[PDB]
Design a protein around this ligand. Structure first.
Ligand SMILES: C/C(=C\COP(=O)(O)OP(=O)(O)O)CO
Ligand code: SF4
Length: 309
């Protein structure tokens, strides 16, 4: 059995920065360090940080006065941010810069009382945070997940309408949503394409290349990782069996028995050691040396704030 590795895969700039923020805060201030939401959606990372004294909460009420609070990489709403500010908390923000970029646009449309539409998945923390940048009752902030949602949406003033997107969406499905938005609201304004980040686009392009070679694709990533689910989904739609797994223990022999080519990738929040362990397991199941596919070289890095270096 041949083992192929997708490239790029694994950690993106925003996840590496966010994890460093929490590690550095723990080393500087000691435990406990409060974190609003899993810093990144990865069980291995989260479980480990818990070990070192990080405490993950959903609501600011959960945090004691005098505490240190870090916002997760997914971002938070202005209401959350203000609630944190109204309290006597020391705050560090691990929101990824590429999410903050979207937030700034939503706040701008809110200040203008002009409606905005967000393409994204209801209930996800990044969508809650981005929708939570809009607070003007004169205008409006609407969420759409699909072309059908667009077909049913009505707005107050489609002459002054703009759109944004979640950073981890399917590139192909978002394209379909945007097409619908432009047919329904011909004066709608947005970025040149969407707000899907370089890491999402690159990992989806890389899994596409991987799936054209592999019969089975294993995506290292947790269940609640949006970007990771998009990678397994993409390979599945190409007709390959694809499994989203947290670690090597999740691999069932049947998935790879008599398979000549198995591919492995990882979501933006999965540490490389999990991939190494998955490769090791596939080897014990008959696989040979892991072969990295050629891919887009990534070079962006986001530094931690000076206050935490
Ligand atoms: C922070 C972030 C992505 C990094 O991966 P995560 O798996 O942590 O988050 P997501 O894909 O949104 O479920 C959203 O920009
Ligand atoms: S997936 Fe993209 S936007 Fe999200 S943390 Fe990573 S680099 Fe930032």
């Amino acid at each position: 059995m041949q083992i192929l590795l997708a490239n790029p895969r694994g950690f993106c700039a925003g996840v590496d920065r966010a994890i460093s923020i929490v590690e550095n805060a723990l080393a500087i201030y000691g435990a406990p360090i409060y974190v609003r939401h899993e810093v990144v959606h990865n069980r291995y990372v989260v479980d480990s940080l818990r070990e070192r004294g990080a405490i993950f909460i959903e609501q600011i009420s959960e945090v004691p006065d005098g505490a240190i609070l870090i916002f997760s990489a997914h971002g938070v709403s202005q209401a959350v941010r203000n609630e944190a500010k109204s309290r006597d908390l020391t705050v560090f923000d691990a929101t990824c810069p590429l999410v903050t970029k979207v937030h700034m646009e939503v706040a701008r449309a809110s200040r203008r009382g002009e409606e905005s539409i967000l393409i994204g998945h209801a209930g996800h923390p990044e969508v809650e945070g981005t929708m939570g940048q809009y607070s003007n009752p004169e205008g409006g902030m609407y969420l759409v997940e699909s072309p059908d949602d667009v077909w049913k949406l009505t707005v107050k003033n489609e002459e002054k309408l703009s759109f944004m997107t979640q950073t981890t969406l399917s590139v192909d499905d978002t394209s379909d949503v945007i097409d619908a938005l432009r047919k329904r609201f011909p004066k709608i304004v947005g970025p040149r394409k969407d707000d899907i980040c370089y890491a999402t686009t690159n990992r989806q392009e890389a899994v596409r290349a991987l799936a054209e070679q592999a019969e089975v694709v294993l995506v290292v990533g947790s269940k609640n990782s949006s970007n990771s689910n998009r990678l397994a989904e993409l390979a599945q739609r190409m007709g390959k069996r694809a499994f989203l797994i947290d670690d090597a223990k999740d691999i069932q022999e049947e998935w790879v028995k008599e398979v000549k080519c198995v591919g492995v990738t990882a979501g933006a929040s999965a540490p490389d050691i999990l991939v190494q362990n998955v490769v090791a397991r596939l080897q014990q199941l008959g696989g040979g040396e892991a072969i990295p596919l050629e891919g887009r070289e990534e070079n962006i890095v986001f530094e931690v704030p000076k206050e935490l270096r």
